[PDB]
Design a protein around this ligand. Structure first.
Ligand code: 09P
Ligand code: 09P
Ligand code: 09P
Ligand code: 09P
Ligand code: 09P
Ligand code: NAG
Lengths: 201, 200, 200, 199, 204
């Protein structure tokens, strides 16, 4: 098998529609935000403009191949793969995807998709000009799949890729997992809450 | 049947251009708005910016399957389904869809599509800075189908409204209208949603 | 015939790129604007922002069917139909289509497409803050088809928003036939005169 | 042949990806701008907002038919035709196309595509509020085809009375430029627009 | 072979999704930015608006043909070719592509794709109103391919203000390029990028 052969098979048999559940177990999706920039803060209206990498990881055995005398990885356009339907519950603009829309696929079936995203959010901005900073929370989860179909789980150094040229600095980043029951359905929907503690320089 | 088989059948036989009428009764569509945020109010020009979930529900027996040893639900890209042509009559911008465009389908043929939408409207904003608040009405209905083809009905408040908004919701009421336009002798149903809100 | 059958036939044989001329006669297109809102006026730069329904009507016998024991109308995505190539000559932005893009088709071949459109224009705005108002003209016609291929013909506050900062005093329509420097053929258009002013 | 037949044949055989060279001679493209409006001038940053028709004309024998008992013209969606890859070198926004994207095709193979375009440019704006006016130049040419594949050549009438500005004069000239990347020459047309603020 | 034949073969056999590696080696991509304009500078927020040509060059033998009595070049829509997945790491808006999306292909398999792009960046703007100017760096590299799959390198050749607009409010003092090889926290592989340093100031 060469790369040409693998990508060919993937294009033909992939099923981008079909969630890769294994035996009535959820697909375990890991989500991690790497903050890159903080752009436009408004303490009056409680809105922020963030740039971050949304590192997303899951398993899809449908994609697997024998990597014996073969490449053990390929890059695949996301249009040819199933992808989790994650959304930011407190976003007030649609995600603007800055980078090429390719996913990394390893021969075992492990997929990683890490787009860079600029997005505007609604959160608590009070104290941004204070020594203790503001704490903004971002809630991310599956939009249509409940806890028995998709589970989201958190995966560091906050500022590792954070821009030195931003007008702001990161004090701390914490992650926690929630399981919420909405008024519509009897099933639970998991999400990850990412708390970003930051202030003006 | 597994999910792969169901989604396959749906993709092949769905007929997204064809309204799923049953013996010449209307398709009963339910509409419900869940307000999430209020963003940019202008009392001078009478314009608001709202973010809301537009929960939409109807029945399409064409999609049904027998689920004896089978999943009883799947998520389907809306491009593969018939979807009601609802529009907001007093919208002054096109809907900006914030979420993935998937619908939930249950084995009986029940469909639910609930996108999160940011949209700008033209409505009565006067008194927004008052203890009694402004009351903005949003009128939503089918754009091309009359009352014998599609009927819209409200469902039988700040539950998801943002605590960080500059505004707060006082009350939300729903009522149904049946209107005859100058163009046609048929009636067109819509739902009017009254949003009572003020500045904090 | 049921709806499923008719929409199927239309999808297979419609020919969206082929103008439905009959025996060398122009397709007769009727155009009517229903004003919904006036949004952003600038008397300095002579620019207005209008929201209107662009009601467009014509005949296409290719789409006809026997409605004996059948539906006499269906809704069709405009991507599956020929549609006239109308443009606003004095528009300074592209049309923003607010509604679902469906046309109404009747069994005789009559098509009606009425999208709601927000668009910015360049026109005479002087006297907008006066008792007699400004008169803005909008010129709409076929972009590439001359008078022997497409003819356009005309058909106030009825659907105008009470919450606009402006009010409509009068709307008049007239038809022009213009010869451009490029070609010896005449191109028809409709000119719609909108007389409006600021309230209070 | 009727219109239905012609449009059918065109859809099946057109080859939009293939430049219609004849005997390895350039395709001769004619370009003409008709100014419709001038919208947002900034003398400080040297930027203007223009609305103009970009009248573009060339020949493609692949599209020809016998007109003998037939129509001699049809309208064709540009997605079904080869079209020249013209670009404005000093544009600072992408073209916003205001009109339906149809080209006019005559039975001999002559094509005309005239979209109305709103675009923002970077040019000399100084003296816009002066009796002699500013002179803004717009440079338009093929982006990827050199002078042996595509040649471009020049060819208030529709200008808005309601603009805050007026046109004093419009001149056209042709340039042939060699860039640092390739040994071939690339043709373009430079359109000089002399305009000022009204009084 | 005529143009029609070559473009036909390319459309049928091209493989846009398959990186054209040769015998286990990186695809060598060359990158060069030609600055055309500087538009909106904000020293307070450290943001600039740039227009530049992004000249990108690589080799794909899959596209080659015998040019013995034939054309030696064609223009191809990028949708029918493999293209390197380059991204600007400090961009804060998506690239706005100003030009037709065609690539130049030579019979040997050499491809050149040079779009004109308007983009907003986050960089050091301090001293823009000073005689010595600001120095803004732009970091460009492959988003998903590591150093053994794609290598990026600055162009060997020499040349800046060559296509820079005389009508900009700003002027270019100098442009330097250097290559970096970075290891990220996610993977054990190295990712190459090019860093382009743009020294510029406001005109007097
Ligand atoms: C019947 C469940 O179908 C649905 C379709 N789209 C969205 C939702 N939502 C509620 C579940 C959790 N996500 C928020 C929206 C539910
Ligand atoms: C008879 C159906 O013809 C029509 C085609 N498009 C829109 C409408 N409208 C009138 C009905 C209510 N919706 C707004 C416009 C009617
Ligand atoms: C030579 C006729 O072909 C044409 C191709 N595109 C546009 C036009 N127009 C001139 C007629 C009126 N509409 C504006 C542009 C004509
Ligand atoms: C080998 C020529 O390939 C090219 C691919 N893209 C753009 C250009 N340009 C330089 C030629 C003149 N036009 C500007 C763009 C050249
Ligand atoms: C495990 C490698 O998979 C990946 C999939 N998408 C993006 C990245 N990135 C990290 C490597 C350097 N480029 C930035 C994004 C990595
Ligand atoms: C290229 O073309 C000529 C004849 O038309 C031929 O002699 C030559 O061998 C060909 N080269 C190849 C296939 O490498």
């Amino acid at each position: 098998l060469d790369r040409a052969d693998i990508l060919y098979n993937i294009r033909q048999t992939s099923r981008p529609d079909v969630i890769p559940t294994q035996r009535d177990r959820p697909v375990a999706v890991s989500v991690s935000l790497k903050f890159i920039n903080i752009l436009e803060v408004n303490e009056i209206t409680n809105e922020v403009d963030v740039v971050f990498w949304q590192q997303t990881t899951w398993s899809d055995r449908t994609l697997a191949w024998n990597s014996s005398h073969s490449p053990d990885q390929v890059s695949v356009p996301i249009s040819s793969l199933w992808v989790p339907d994650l959304a930011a519950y407190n976003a007030i603009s649609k995600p603007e995807v800055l980078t090429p829309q390719l996913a990394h696929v390893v021969s075992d079936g492990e997929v990683q998709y890490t787009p860079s995203i600029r997005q505007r959010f609604s959160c608590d901005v009070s104290g941004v000009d204070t020594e203790s900073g503001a704490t903004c929370r971002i809630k991310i989860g599956s939009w249509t799949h409940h806890s028995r179909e998709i589970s989201v789980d958190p995966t560091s150094d906050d500022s590792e890729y954070f821009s030195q040229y931003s007008r702001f600095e990161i004090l701390d980043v914490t992650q926690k997992k929630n399981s919420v029951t909405y008024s519509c359905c009897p099933e639970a929907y998991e999400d990850v809450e990412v708390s970003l503690n930051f202030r003006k320089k």
